[PDB]
Amino acid sequence: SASAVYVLDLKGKVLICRNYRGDVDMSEVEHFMPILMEKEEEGMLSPILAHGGVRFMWIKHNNLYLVATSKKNACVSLVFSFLYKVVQVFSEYFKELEEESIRDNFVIIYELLDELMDFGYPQTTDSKILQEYITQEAPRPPATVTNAVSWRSEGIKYRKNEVFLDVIEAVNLLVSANGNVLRSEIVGSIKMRVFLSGMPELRLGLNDKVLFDNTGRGKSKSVELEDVKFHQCVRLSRFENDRTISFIPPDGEFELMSYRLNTHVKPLIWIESVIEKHSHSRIEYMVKAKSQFKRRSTANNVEIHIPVPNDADSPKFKTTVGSVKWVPENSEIVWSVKSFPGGKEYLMRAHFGLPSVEAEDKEGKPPISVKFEIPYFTTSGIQVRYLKIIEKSGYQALPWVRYITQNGDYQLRTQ
């Protein structure tokens, strides 16, 4: 129950303001950045700032503090998911989100912040449905805003009827400093690109372990879905009954399902390293990179980052495969190898200098974090199986799919 949805600058003046209830006075926005500094410098950097009986919830985009005030007992995750959905809607309109937009596209953004919320309540937050009655180029509102099926306005027609599925692996990993796996989980996300005609219905075929166990085919290759969180479009009770993903799809880009399993198959890229940190002289990185997966796939454009001392100097990089640039902006090396086959080992040996006079504060030990990406390969073993198009017309659509293996936060610890 926000009382004023704010967008501030990085200083503390108002880019755009939109109050609803009168519970928070408009003068109360002026205290936000001093409270931010006075709570940030003492370890209490919290998303819920406090000013007497007036609270401050906020998220931080690149140049923007989407501040959301409240005075009573606000439902908090409501307001934060409201603010992230406002961020995603504005990124659907304005492909970048800066101060150049807000102080100049203020014709339409006040109307958006009138539409999204009344008396503190998020009510109509789909981007595509908000497009067809809020334009920057007005009729009656579409009934899709009022209708139960609220993410697909009827009357959409394309000449062909293409549906593109993108299955994205994102391996999260955190290997400890001894050489063992702490956590090998996989956050997978199926992102679909749907161009269909009318009001269709799709039923997705997965090789689920649970659906095969309800059928009687849990002895072939299947995926153990430890948890799945679907989009709003999937009728969840039909999934609760017999693992059935029934949904009226949206138009264009959307995220279908956000699953999260565990997998005790080996890590994809192994990073053994040593650090001979001689004091006040130099440092050595005899790091090796082997791949545990099969010898058929190729890892595109990997970026094996290794954090270095903050004030090192005169780098040398004797490699065998792949370029190095030393990036002192974040004080990191970026060991990049473009074409990376499976099962091979590429060795790299760096060598720096280090200052004589020691620093005032210590530097911290950030982790190695690689940025690999592999197509046509899944570590999970998940395969999509079927996708039925249901339509009163009845036609031949073309469901296309590809398999992407990426990283999530693929960190490996250092010494």
Partner 1 sequence: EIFELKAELNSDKKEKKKEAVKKVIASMTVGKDVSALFPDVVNCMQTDNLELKKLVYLYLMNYAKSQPDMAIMAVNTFVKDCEDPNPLIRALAVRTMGCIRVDKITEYLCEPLRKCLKDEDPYVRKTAAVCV
Partner 2 sequence: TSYDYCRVPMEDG
Provide the mask over 367-396, with x wherever binding to partner 2 is found by CB under 8 A and - wherever it is not. Answer: --------xx-------xxxxxx------x
Minimum Å gap between C-beta 215 and partner 2 is 12
Minimum Å gap between C-beta 64 and partner 1 is 15
* Binding site partner of 187, from partner 2, partner 1, none, Cβ cut-off 5-8 A by kind: none
Q: How far is 354 from 280, CA to CA, in rounded Å?
A: 6
Q: Judged by CB, which is closer to partner 2: 180, or 220?
A: 220
Q: Which of 404, 407, 410, 412 lies at the binding interface for partner 2 (CB under 8 A)?
A: 404
Quickly count: other Cβ atoms within 10 Å of residue 169's Cβ: 22
* Binding site partner of 205, from partner 1, partner 2, none, Cβ cut-off 5-8 A by kind: partner 2
Place of tokens 């934060």: 80
Q: Which of 96, 99, 100, 111 lies at the binding interface for partner 1 (CB under 8 A)?
A: 111
Question: What one-character-per-residue DSSP string does 367-411 give?
Answer: PEE---EEES--SS---EEEEEEE-SS----EEEEEEEEEEEEEE
Q: Judged by CB, which is closer to partner 2: 102, or 404?
A: 404
Q: Does 78 bind partner 1 (CB under 8 A)?
A: no
Minimum Å gap between C-beta 61 and partner 1 is 19
Q: Which of 19, 246, 336, 378 lies at the binding interface for partner 1 (CB under 8 A)?
A: 19
DSSP state of 140: P
Q: Judged by CB, which is closer to partner 1: 23, or 208?
A: 23
- In 242-355 the beta strands, taken as DSSP E runs, fall at 245-247, 252-262, 269-272, 284-291, 298-307, 313-318, 323-327, 332-341, 345-353
**Ordered strands of the 65-70 beta sheet:** 14-19, 4-8, 65-70, 54-60, 48-51
Please list the residues that pair with 14 across neighbouring strands.
8
Of 328, 347, 213, which Cα lies nearest the Cα of 287?
347
* Binding site partner of 157, from partner 1, partner 2, none, Cβ cut-off 5-8 A by kind: none
How many residues interact with partner 1 (rule CB under 8 A)? 26
Residue 42: Cβ-neighbour burial (10 angstroms; 0-12, 13-18, 19+): exposed
What end-to-end distance do the CA atoms of the chain give, in Å?
A: 47
Whole-angstrom Cα Rg for the chain: 26
Angle at 144 between CA 94 and CA 139, to 5 degrees: 70
Q: Does 20 bind partner 1 (CB under 8 A)?
A: yes
Q: How far is 410 from 415, CA to CA, in rounded Å?
A: 17
* Binding site partner of 145, from partner 1, partner 2, none, Cβ cut-off 5-8 A by kind: partner 1
Provide the token pair at 164.
Answer: 């593109």
HEC profile for 46-79? CCEEEECCEEEEEEECCCCEEEEEECCCCCHHHH
* Binding site partner of 11, from partner 2, partner 1, none, Cβ cut-off 5-8 A by kind: none
Of 68, 71, 26, which Cα lies nearest the Cα of 51?
71
Minimum Å gap between C-beta 110 and partner 1 is 5
Minimum Å gap between C-beta 224 and partner 2 is 21
Site for partner 1 in 121-140 (CB under 8 A): 121, 123, 133, 138-140
How many residues interact with partner 2 (rule CB under 8 A)? 19
Q: Does 224 bind partner 1 (CB under 8 A)?
A: no
Residue 343: alpha-carbon gap to chain centroid: 29
Contact 352, 324 (CB under 8 A): no
* Binding site partner of 19, from partner 1, partner 2, none, Cβ cut-off 5-8 A by kind: partner 1
Q: Judged by CB, which is closer to partner 2: 5, or 165?
A: 165
Minimum Å gap between C-beta 106 and partner 1 is 5
Provide the mask over 179-218, with x wherever binding to partner 2 is found by CB under 8 A and - wherever it is not. Answer: --------------------------x-------------
Provide the mask over 26-45, with x wherever binding to partner 1 is found by CB under 8 A and - wherever it is not. Answer: x-------------------
Q: How far is 216 from 326, CA to CA, in rounded Å?
A: 55
Q: Does 401 bind partner 2 (CB under 8 A)?
A: yes
Q: Does 119 bind partner 1 (CB under 8 A)?
A: yes
- Which residues of this chain interact with partner 2, rule CB under 8 A? 164-165, 205, 375-376, 384-389, 396-402, 404
- Which residues of this chain interact with partner 1, rule CB under 8 A? 13-14, 16-17, 19-22, 26, 103, 106-107, 110-111, 114, 118-119, 121, 123, 133, 138-141, 145-146
